[PDB]
Design a protein around this ligand. Structure first.
Ligand SMILES: Cc1cc(C(F)(F)F)nn1CC(=O)Nc1sc2c(c1C(N)=O)CCCC2
Ligand SMILES: N[C@@H](CCC(=O)O)C(=O)O
Ligand SMILES: N[C@@H](CCC(=O)O)C(=O)O
Ligand SMILES: [Zn+2]
Ligand SMILES: [Zn+2]
Ligand SMILES: [Zn+2]
Lengths: 260, 260
């Protein structure tokens, strides 16, 4: 009936521009895990769709003062998109305003270091000051630290919120580049999925250290009242049970892996 | 207003009879992860509740011929219970007939061996005959194998469905006992959570081997149209984000683990 507007975000390897994208049009410009997922979800739910990259390049957070949502969440809330198919973390504040499918991928917050950085844990980071560390802006990881009552994470947040120069970054790519150029003096807090991906990318100079700080998942999000909610939810479960989600993770993370 | 009837299942360490249960009343008769979780869900959602143990001791399957649901799923479907708070796996066939919250615990199907069994993977099991293997006789693990189109799992199902005497077991405890008494000649396919629990129980003679075969979760289930659906879902998210779910796992799996 109507073309479904999918909001997504340029985040490797979920959605990336193809090497030859400039000569391509519409959905064909993009590739990645979420591009593949979107095609599968659309197939099983029987809709046509248009992939649109989120205008402000953000996942989604609510301004404390205006109460206005930004990012992909904002696009859903304000009716600019019909569905978000992205590595969008299922969170309480978000699930209060949009609906999430069952998770299509699990993750937890993790630590990325430049190889050789003498840091093994969140506790290690919190104890010292020589190595700076931060998170992505307008995402679920920043909110995790902001809200945490756990002493280690509370101390980390107290440090991060005030740190000069700013330890927060606008994009995951910015966080990763920062780790890579900072000679071991910057650690980055990011989701395990993204961390593991980057660990298998040239120049193979980063690694994930320590356990995950939490356990959660990404979900496909729809605005409240969406006619797509049930079908999308069931389609995620179908794709999981077919082993398709695992196949896609292997395709985008490890099959193309550059670090041996 | 009205006391919420909770269906659950006697499965360690989720729900267990307290040693002194005969001298206790109602909800106080039980202990475990899901007992603790039920109390917290009820507090956060503002309802009074009565724990009940599923009459038939099953999780929930639909009979192929009668189309009747058994187990906890049936208790929800047929209106015998208002909510299931148990290690109940989120599956497509169940989500078609009941609602699940977001997952409160992650798990995958996994392999339990008697220590020293020369099995490292599902592939290993599928390629040999000396070591028998089976699943819980009703549940999502059996269904995974029944429905699988992946070669290794198909081969396994082909073996399991035809094996005489039956490789299937009535309860997890029966599966574990069978591994323990079979001198390495039986391996049990069960959820990683249950596997990890038993690995920390005396006599410390079993272990999880290989990676998980899939990735899913347990959810709190409510019948369709339940007024509890949203509150329960948000309560799971709140409890995850506040670290309670991880605390409860540690409490019931590891804090009093018997294997060092
Ligand atoms: C990969 C997969 C598919 C399925 C499903 F299909 F069964 F739903 N579950 N999972 C595992 C998963 O994502 N776990 C999740 S997501 C999530 C939480 C947990 C958890 N703590 O276990 C806690 C609240 C925030 C959102
Ligand atoms: N997946 C996160 C963004 C990345 C992060 O915060 O680490 C979100 O949905 O906000
Ligand atoms: N958690 C499973 C039962 C255990 C199993 O099948 O391994 C279910 O909900 O069916
Ligand atoms: Zn498909
Ligand atoms: Zn503002
Ligand atoms: Zn509480």
């Amino acid at each position: 009936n109507k073309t479904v507007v999918v909001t997504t975000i340029l985040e490797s390897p979920y959605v990336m521009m193809k090497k030859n994208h400039e000569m391509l049009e519409g959905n064909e410009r993009y590739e990645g895990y979420c591009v593949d997922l979107a095609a599968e979800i659309a197939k099983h739910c029987g809709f046509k769709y248009k992939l649109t990259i989120v205008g402000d390049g953000k996942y989604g957070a609510r301004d404390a003062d205006t109460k206005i949502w930004n990012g992909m969440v904002g696009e859903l809330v304000y009716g600019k998109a019909d569905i978000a198919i992205a590595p969008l973390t299922i969170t309480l504040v978000r699930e209060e305003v949009i609906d999430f499918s069952k998770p299509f991928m699990s993750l937890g917050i993790s630590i990325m270091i430049k190889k050789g950085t003498p840091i093994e844990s969140a506790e290690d980071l919190s104890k010292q000051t020589e190595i700076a560390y931060g998170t992505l802006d307008s995402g679920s990881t920043k909110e995790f630290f902001r809200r945490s009552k756990i002493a280690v994470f509370d101390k980390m947040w107290t440090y991060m919120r005030s740190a000069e120069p700013s330890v927060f970054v606008r994009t995951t790519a910015e966080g990763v580049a920062r780790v890579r150029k900072s000679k071991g003096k910057y650690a980055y807090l990011l989701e395990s999925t993204m961390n593991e991906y980057i660990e298998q990318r040239k120049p193979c100079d980063t690694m994930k250290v320590g356990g995950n700080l939490d356990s959660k998942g990404y979900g496909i999000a729809t605005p409240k009242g969406s006619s797509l909610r049930n079908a999308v939810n069931l389609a995620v479960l179908k794709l999981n049970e077919q082993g398709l989600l695992d196949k896609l993770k292997n395709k985008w993370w490890y099959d193309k892996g550059e670090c041996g």
